[PDB]
Amino acid sequence: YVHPTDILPSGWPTATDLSGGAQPRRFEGTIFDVMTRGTIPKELHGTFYRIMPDYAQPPTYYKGGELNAPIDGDGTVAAFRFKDGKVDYRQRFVETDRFKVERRARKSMYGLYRNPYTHHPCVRQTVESTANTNVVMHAGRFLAMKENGNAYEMDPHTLKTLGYNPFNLPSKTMTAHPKQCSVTGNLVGFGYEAKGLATKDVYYFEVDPSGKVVRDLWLEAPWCAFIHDCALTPNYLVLMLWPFEANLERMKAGGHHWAYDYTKPITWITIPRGAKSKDEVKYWHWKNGMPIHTASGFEDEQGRIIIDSSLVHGNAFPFFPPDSDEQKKKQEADGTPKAQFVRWTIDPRKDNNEQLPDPEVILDTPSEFPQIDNRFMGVEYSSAFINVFVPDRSDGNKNVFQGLNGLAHYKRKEGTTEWYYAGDNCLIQEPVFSPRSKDAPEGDGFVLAIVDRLDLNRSEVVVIDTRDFTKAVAAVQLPFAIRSGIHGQWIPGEVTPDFETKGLVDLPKEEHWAPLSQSPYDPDA
Ligand SMILES: COc1cc(C=O)ccc1O
Ligand SMILES: [Fe+2]
């Protein structure tokens, strides 16, 4: 009933990812010609890169790792490269300064999320990023990102780490949610806590297609807020502030970086693109809640900023609770918050001191990890591909990151939603979209996502044709499970350096090792 070796002690603390799963994976390597079921679309020409937290060492430095968060673990990138119907896989850890210290020491040397006062003395003045949140290919460079530092660059074929801060941003941080403008090609983004721990400074930038900062601006947030995501429109970058606040004194006392604050309203910072002065920036507010990710934004015909996001009516990261006893009690009392997918209207003609209108409910179901058709980034878009709790086939009492068992294809223009169910005893992660061809209509093509086959100890990539969103056309079947991850991206072959000549796996040499004379076969025999 109980295996004798299973009661042998482990030295690992519980190291969850956002799904709640706690199994360390940590493998680095490849599979050539990954097993597939069904037919891989020949139209897929590119790489699905996904990034996951997977603590490389047992994170036992601070309080035995008891307070490690699911967003903390060392970033590892899995790449699934599709070319002529074949799929290869490669996975590798980002060689962050943190990872390198810990691997070389064979020992955890970092404490609480974003709290250097809980790191090992010898590493306090390192970049503490685990580069584990998102990836982007911009100006021919492949980047792994986490918002508490600049990006690390990796080779897109070998996933070897190449360097830190490739665009030489002057801020200490860069968002893991920069947006690649479909008009200018600019990577548009920001970094908050731009001058160090608990600073209110925010740095806005646009890095052009050549890898140079062409526009930037220093500004501040109204408080030191957790600014995870943003929305790009033709004329604005819009920052989205979560109701957490940082407190240096709390950190110095060995407490968490962030504490949720029920008294903070959701706040937006509009930054006119190419603004010459921080006087052009405006703060907008609604009410308390946690809008985790934007799908995208645009400006309507009358110049209003329209942004769709998830909206959790409470704290989706309960592991960063409020400071006060009163607010802590409220978090416990609230239980699992209501979660939806909503649409915000920020009309720049209006007085920003006036509270924003209530957002419109788009999907009345827990919704997270939305993506769009990237051909429409920073302009009007219609398609969103959304990770969802499937209506009437999902728990509801699970934390928003822990019960995502379907995908939705929402089309604003048609006002339709189509649904993909991951399967019984399955979870599914964030979707990515590949257009059927360069000039396919918006949202016409293939959606890919990682499925956890929970009873099988394996992970799979499903491929869905948008012409029938309810059905997978193919599954890429790994021989094992990988961590449940955060973001991933469909990166077209056309924007990947040497995609035509380099695979994820280098071919062995042509020349035989052995001489002809060693063959068992003789054509004369
Ligand atoms: C995986 O790292 C993070 C993830 C998030 C939300 O998904 C916010 C901050 C992080 O550092
Ligand atoms: Fe994110």
Author numbering: 24 to 548
Reproduce passages from the article.
Herein, Moesziomyces aphidis DSM 70725 aromatic dioxygenase (MapADO) is characterized through X-ray crystallography, biophysical as well as biochemical assays, substrate docking and mutagenesis. MapADO features a seven-bladed β-propeller fold and a Fe2+ center coordinated by four histidine residues and shares a conserved structural motif with homologous enzymes despite low sequence identity (<38%). O2 is activated by this nonheme iron and reacts with the C–C double bond of a substrate, eventually leading to C–C bond scission and two carbonyl species as the reaction products.
MapADO was cocrystallized with excess (40-fold mol) ligands 3 and 1 (products of 3a and 1a cleavage, respectively). MapADO’s interaction with ligands 4-hydroxybenzaldehyde, ortho-vanillin and vanillin indicate that hydrogen-bonding of the phenolic OH group is key to activity. Fe2+ is coordinated to H200, H251, H316, and H510 and a water molecule. The sixth coordination site is occluded by T156.
